[model samples]
Target chain A: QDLLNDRIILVTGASDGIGREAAMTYARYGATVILLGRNEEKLRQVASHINEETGRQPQWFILDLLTCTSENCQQLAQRIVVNYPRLDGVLHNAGLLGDVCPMSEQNPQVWQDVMQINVNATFMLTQALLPLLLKSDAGSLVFTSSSVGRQGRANWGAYAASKFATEGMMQVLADEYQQRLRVNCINPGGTRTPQKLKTPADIMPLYLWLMGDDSRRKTGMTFDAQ
Target chain B: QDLLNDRIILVTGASDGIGREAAMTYARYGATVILLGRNEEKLRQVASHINEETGRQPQWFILDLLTCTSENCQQLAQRIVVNYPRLDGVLHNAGLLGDVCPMSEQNPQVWQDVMQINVNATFMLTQALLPLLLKSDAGSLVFTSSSVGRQGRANWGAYAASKFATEGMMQVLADEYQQRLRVNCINPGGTRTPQKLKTPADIMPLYLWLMGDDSRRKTGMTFDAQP
Candidate 1:
């Protein structure tokens, strides 16, 4: 339970689903969790739930990833830098699932939107937060991907491409940071969170294992959350 | 010499470098080459060379991939459909290598520009051209990738991500069109073209093989030029 004691973890898309469950579980394990989502009410409710359970009021932020710019992401990173000593971990869980259509029928507008949210925003945020993450002795950067990310599937379209970009970003950071910081991806395939899903909370063990010091040597690999 | 005989192959970034060499060589092999590039004079010169040698005036189009949109790509595809019967192959050779830097120091605008040229624009063009390529008995969709694409490097940044996306797109298309139209990646590597030690002409055998009937069964795989 104390695996994350004194650690500061940030989870994007923390308002609901896997993200919310991960944030709550991290808080329960004695870490100070930072909640990030577009919705204020859901963020507040999630944060309040964590605070009620752990007696620690988590800081929540509102940033619409669909339209977030690098400047704003940098500003957000700066805010974190000032308030917190350093980020021990960051769970990049927010993403978009664009049309489940074939490549030929993929809408360019929707494809661009998915790339903006799932890849560009994540890249911008990572660029901004790299400094803070490096400050920690053993920082972990986790990105959420999909089965489609590793192997392209039929009708996956933009979402599959975006997830592959995420995997690339994680790999790049892992190789760049090496012993300084650990980076990896978790492909939460068909979870309770969605369509016989094991639900979000059921997948916290892998998430917790990655965020904790026990998996300090594991980096640049994708793990299936089963 | 006649491996690509009677074929219609489109080569992007054909103004100079590997693309120009490939387009010229494809012409030498009897394929009716289509030259595509952003520059007017260079494209004209390349087309002129191909026409003089092959006696077939290759059509050239000026498309700035970094600034092209889906609408324009579709329009260009439509223009090609009207002029030619159907494209036998499409060599996606155009790419942008933004400032080599770490991901943390990567410039947002430059990153977007690289994605535009290497990933997004390529994707739009592929979507537009798939129909025409599928019309052929055997279509070869070749995307140019770098070593950094399969394995990320210390300072490759946007180029690496873009190439990875390129690989992903190729894989998806290959799966979707299995046995219909072949899709693959050619890693030209640091060749005589750039850092290359074999000039682009020296690497034509693989390009020639991939576009011709010999390598019809190869799809969803990345091949090195030297290997």
Candidate 2:
């Protein structure tokens, strides 16, 4: 657990579910966690809990990634650079659950909204934060994906499609950075989050292992954290 | 080749390469080909060739897919329905070869351009034309993909990523429509399309096969035309 001592990690969607659990877990492991989510109150609550439990002050950032533009992301990145000199790891866990309808019946607005949040925002944020991540000794990027992301299923609609884009972004970044940064994907499978049936704690070990020093050599692969 | 007789197929990027060859081949097979490309002169030349060789008047639409918006796509779709009541097939072959650079070195404009053309435009066009495609007895959507799309390649950048999204779109649409509208991906694989070494004709048989009735039972699969 001491493996993450002195690390600075950012956890998006940290107000609830796997993001919240991951933020708390990283804090317990001695890393400074940056909690980012849409709900400001929930984010502060998670931040407070992490600090109380671990005696480590975690920061909270209220960023609704869904509505954030590239410029907005750049500004957030600037603020992050000023506040945290380096970023040891980033867990892109935020997502949107778009309508699960037949393609013919899909609302175009909803489809665009899903892609905007799930894929474009992820890309914009990562691109904006790359400089900070590169400052660390061994940076790691773990994108939260789904089983359906790698393989499509009926009625999954834009959500499924957006996940595939996430996987692609992970692979592209992994190949581009090579030894410079460790980029990987994790599919939490079905878990205890509101989105699933199992607890987010069940997936903490995998998340911890990926962010630790032992995974320095791993890049460009997807892990099913079942 | 006569299997496409009386059919209507729309071919994007019809100025050259696989799209151009496919346009010609489909025309020869008796399908009324609608040639779409950015270059008006080149598209008209292809349309003229098809008219001359096959005695069929191939249509042409000049469109810059990269700059086209969703509303523009819908308008184009409307025009297409006016010209041809039903579309039996759509060949989503338009693409942009963006800079192959390290992710850090990639130009953001290039990345967005690739996605805008290779992914968003394709989506908008497909969505706009879905109704027309559904009117046919059988509908087929063939998206041109790449080997790098399924797996990451160093320096491929957004082009590779865009292709992955293309594959994903294909899969999602395939799953959504099922037997009603056949959706598939074809990786032309290092072909003579200025991107690869082999001739586009080398891969035409597969394109023809997919557009014909024989492939009605095949959907949601990726094919490589290379031997």
Candidate 3:
């Protein structure tokens, strides 16, 4: 029997990168997956891939976290409640590789966009979807965060800044709602993504271990993806 | 001219203790104070005291943070936005002191309640009232946090856990907003609050210094509130 045979999982930014991989992995282990992203073609590709491999058609919704309004958040949550009744786990993998720039040079608009996606979206989505999550016997909400999120780094700028906010917000949610929901922050440190093939190849094992039960008791921690 | 002239500052759980003193001090320092609590008579008494002392009529809104819904939060924010136009500051001082027990013994309901007031309400309220704060030329949001927030203590249990969440949330807002909005946390130590009296006494000057501009250059730091 699969560990996640009866689980329902939702992953944002699932069209590519870690989100896409996570969706595939979760589904492979028998979880019914919901993929959320902006790229229709890429989203469909991911859904198709999951279904092809696991023989379970993974569901997906086209939504952009950057501009997702509160109404949209409410609707998504309500839809999930009606359809699934409960979610065994949530990997909030939706985020943007915000403009890499110095604080002195970054525009407030860019910063706001990053914050909206990283912090505001996390808050709104989790809050709205919390009812369904609470319905589960044990719900896990994991925020995809960054290493720099633990400490401030100057040029990392908006992305780092937003991740810090993400880390704190997740900690707050975890500590606040710990009784019903186990919250954690996973910093997928420096992995090679399409935007940049920068992560030194040494960090993939840590990331794999985190997703597995090897690091199960680590809640509310900012785990290094490396 | 006072720094906060004509600006409305809402201090929750302000009928007594640190909250009462904060309301009085804010009004004394030229803010139009809005006091929130469940005790109407106590609110009236505190308001009367502030008015008598500062010759400024402080307002009161009776709402329990524990029971406050997002709708209630929005309505409260709306009311503040209308009456005050620009909210200069909000000192979120309301929190539930859950049963002082180990995490294993902590009831799920109590844990949720602690998290609700200490972390969720604070963030939700700040989010709801942010637009109003942004309207101000200068906005200050302060959270009443604790020493146990930064470092985990042995038996502090849910209270410390909630405070840590408060500290983390403050840092998140600070980092996300950067210099646009000023967010802060005050771990008021040795204060003569009923809660403090339940324990022992300690030094508390760090708390006062943080609320003042003396600590602006040192933002995003987890302060040792106790001496």
Candidate 4:
């Protein structure tokens, strides 16, 4: 667990769910966790919990990667450059389950919003923070994919399409950055997050194993994190 | 050799390359070929060549599906609905290799163009034309995917990304439309196209075999076209 002792990592959507658990777990492994999310109150609470439990202060940046645009990404990059100077990993777990309905009835605006946050946001974030990520000796980018992303389920239209797009983006990044950064798409299939109950209690251990070193060698793979 | 006898098949990108060859071969097997591509002259030449060689008249449509918008797809669908009314199979062989260059050096316009053609175009075309295809007793939607698409290549950035998206879209669509349509991705590994040099003579038989009924009941799979 001390493998990430001197490493600095960032977790998007860190205020709740898998992102929150990832931040806490990473912090427990002796790394400084930087939390980015819309919920500043929850972000601070998570940061405080990490600090109090581990006695190692983690950072909290109340920034929304979506709607902030590429400029926001550059600004965040600049801030990290001046302040921390190094980041080892980034877990891009921030996304929403947009309207699960037929494409015939889907509002174009809502579809765009889901695609923007799910696919474009990841591209923008990775592009903006790439320098900081590359600054490390070895970096990793874990993108959260879905079962719908790989296999189309009826009524799970835009959300599924966005995840499919995210998986493509992840593969592209992984191919391009394989020399420096290792990128992988994690399909956290059925977790007991407040979002949707898809799996049983016995499945949580597999989810935890991914954050650790056991899955370090497996990059550019769409894993079923069950 | 008579595998596609009396089969009504639609082959896109039929002016040249694998689509052209598949059309000729199928037409020779007593199949009525609906050839879709941009170049009317080249398409006529292909049709004439098929007729001269196989004693059959292959249908031709001068429409570029890459630049085809949603409206265009709808128009094509309407035309197909009124004219053909039914289709036995659809080989989605149309693809656009949008500027093979590094992603950092690639233009956004070009990348979007690739995505529009490779992903959106495929999806829209399939959706619009699926009605006609579904009318058949046993319709098939065989997508042409690249090896580079499965494992990303360095310089083939946008093209690779588009093909990857197409593969995923095909998977999702297959899962949803399995009961109605038989969808599969055919990785026609290293075939001899006019643009590229001819592959070995041994590679010829698999192409014929795939077009035949030898490979059926395989859906939602990415197969190495060589059986």
Candidate 5:
């Protein structure tokens, strides 16, 4: 039952959907989950729910990744490094589905916004947290992606492009880090949380597998959670 | 041989290496090439050479892609749309090879710089010129990539990452545009331009095929210049 006993994991977008579920699941398994999301109230509620269920209140942080700057990333990392003894895992689950349209009709502003969060922030946060992650015996970085990300589809717009960049980022980091960390991109494939293809619970086993010691040797790979 | 007769193509980084050779070769094939590079003098020299050889002076423009902002790209596109009747092709060749190091040791500024030219500017330029390209009976957009771009190498750093982004951008654009505009990425591998593996001339055939009607049916594909 306590698969993640003594482990510490941080889950972004932890206020809702798969991120929220993953956080609670990790907590139930005896890990101290860190809840990170933009909506402070929602995060507090999730943290409270975990407290009631697991008898341990998860830490919550409010950071809007969309408008987050480099300085903000640094401060967040500094806080985590100083406060948290070791971070075993990071779930980069936050994402934005920009306007769905043809490439010709897609707004440049929306394009920039989507990319800023999905690609730019992911890179900045990963880079910032690398040192903290290295402190753990097995560090895991999970990048959430979509099927459209694997093969570009019509009308997906910047969302697809951003996910592609995410996969690329994961691959590059995985190669550079080698055995130091396990970096993976998981294409949830239209999950039931909102998109209605696969249940979020259906994918937890894979997520938990990656977060645990089972995936210590796995790196630079893309997984399909179907 | 008049294969590109009446065609108009824009070649970036046209002053040297594969870019220069592509511009000259396009001119030889009867295409009116627009030469773009950071150095005006070098662009002028290349333009003069093309003019002397082809009896037609190629158009030249100077813009440092690394520092070129979105507004700058729009203004440049506006000028081109007004002056040039049609743009049939774009050789997205300009790029920067930043520091080769592990990701941790790489400077954020250097990473941004490399991505700005290699990925961001390429997208901005293509987006700016999509209209003019669509105006043509046939349109082609070719992105220059590297072997390192296809697979992440240990020390390729930002250059490799940018190329991966470039490939993704190409794929998304290609799927979205479909038949309206042809988009493809070419990895020249280790070329004699500096790496001493393949020559600029060796990859021109594939370049020519993509620019011509032969590759009209092909879209969203990555090609290796060598086997």
Candidate 6:
């Protein structure tokens, strides 16, 4: 449980869902967890909850991934650099699920929005944080992917496309940083039903494994979380 | 000799390279080829060359995928709709090879530009052309992909990512339109050396097979040219 002791991990979209659970999980294990998301209230709540549970103060930052440009991402990284000596892990958990419709009927504007968050912004954030991440002896950079990303399905639209991009981005980074940093994608396990998403807490083990030294040698692979 | 007999096909980035070859090949086989690219001089030359070789006038249009929005794509499609009865095939061959650098060294501005052309604009064009393509009895929607896209490699940067997006986009469309349209990606044949790319003409056979009726049942598949 103390696998992340003294580690500094950053979780995007930490205000809710898997990112929230990941932030909490990392903190409980003795890491200085950083919460990042667009929702200030939820960020506050998540940070407060982390402190309440772990009896340690965690930092929270407001970052709207949807509209974040390269320069802004660099700025955010600077702020992070000042607060933390190094980032042991970073979970790129923030994602946008656009219209789940056929490609012929997909809304172009909404599609762009999904690409912005899922592919472009994720890339920009990765670019900004690489320097800080490489500072660690064993840095982990994890991206969130899905089955829809592995293979295209009907009505998944831009969501599916973006994930494929995510997978590709992860693969490239993994190949590039194999010697120094570990890059992998966490394709969270699915539920029995299609409508109901699997609980964020259910996939914490994989998150823990990836963030901690247990997965020190892992890189260039997509791990499914159950 | 008349495989694409009277067929109407559109090739993006058709001014040169594999796209130019595909246009010429399709037109030679009796297809009414439509060329799209940013270079007006090259488009004119390709169109004039097609006319000189095949003795048939081909249409050329200026579409800078770098800056094109949905509205402009729709407008371009409307223009195509006015002139052509239907699109028998569309080869999304245009691609931008951004900085061939490592992830940490990739230029942000160049990265976005690559994504804009290879992913965003490609999807926008697909949305606009779907209706026209659906009109064909054997509609073929082909995209260009790469080995780097199928399995990422170091130093490819944004170009590799966009192609993976292209592969995903193609796969999703193939699943969605399997009944009406046949969507596939042609990963052009590779060369012996790493630095030198294979000649554009070397991959024409796969391109021809895809655009013709031979691959009518093919969809949701990425076929390498050498395969």
The C-alpha lDDT values of all candidates are 0.88, 0.85, 0.69, 0.72, 0.83, 0.89
What's each prediction's TM-score?
A: 0.97, 0.91, 0.56, 0.77, 0.92, 0.96
lDDT of 2 by residue, A172-208 (tens): 8887888889999999988863754668888788999
* A1-226: candidate 3 lDDT, tens digit per residue: 3767787878888898788878887787778889988899999999988889999898788778887765687798777776787876788888876666544344445655665677666656776677777776677778887766666554555566456556655655656665667678777776776566444334444434444455555567777655
TM-score of chain B alone in model 6: 0.95
User: What is the C-alpha lDDT profile of model 1 across A83-169, one tens digit per residue?
Assistant: 899999999989888888899999998998888888888889888888888888898999989888888877888888788777888
lDDT ranking from best candidate downward: 6, 1, 2, 5, 4, 3
lDDT of 1 at A60: 91
Winner on lDDT (1 vs 6): 6
Off-target runs (Cα >4 Å) in candidate 3 are A1-3, A194-218, B1-221, B225-227
Badly placed stretches (over 4 Å) of model 4 are A1-6, A24-30, A36-79, A96-121, A147-179, A192-223, B38-68, B99-109, B153-156, B192-216
TM-score, cand. 1: 0.97
Q: Which one wins by lDDT: 1 or 5?
A: 1
Residues B43-63, model 1: lDDT tens digits: 999998888888978998878
Evaluate residue A97 in candidate 5 and report its C-alpha lDDT on the 0 to 100 scale: 90
Q: Rank by DockQ, highest first.
A: 6, 1, 2, 5, 4, 3
In order of TM-score, best first, we have 1, 6, 5, 2, 4, 3
To one decimal place, how large is model 4's interface RMSD in Å?
A: 2.9
For each candidate in turn, the interface RMSD (Å) is 1.0, 1.7, 8.6, 2.9, 2.0, 0.8
> What would the per-residue lDDT of candidate 5 be over residues A1-226, giving only the tens digit for each residue?
8788988899998999989989988998889898889998999999999999989999888788888876787789888877798899999999889888877677767776787788777777777778888988888999998887677777887787677777777777888888689999888776763554667878888878888887788999989875
lDDT of 6 by residue, B95-208 (tens): 888899888889988988998899889999999999999899989999989988889999998988898888888888888886889999988856432446677777688889
Indicate the DockQ of the complex predicted as candidate 3.
Answer: 0.06
Cα lDDT tens digits for candidate 4, A1-226: 5856887888898998888888887788777889989888898899889989899877778667558676687788787787787778888889978776654444445654665677656666776777787787777777889888777666676577667777777777777776777778778876764546654334435444544566565567787765
Better of 3 and 4 by DockQ: 4
TM score of chain A per candidate: 0.97, 0.96, 0.89, 0.90, 0.96, 0.96
Q: Which runs in model 1 stand beyond 4 Å of their true positions?
A: A192-195, B193-196
Report model 6's chain A TM-score.
0.96
**Candidate 4's residue-wise lDDT over B15-53, tens digit each?**
767887888877877788888888999999999999999
What global local distance difference test value does model 6 have?
0.89
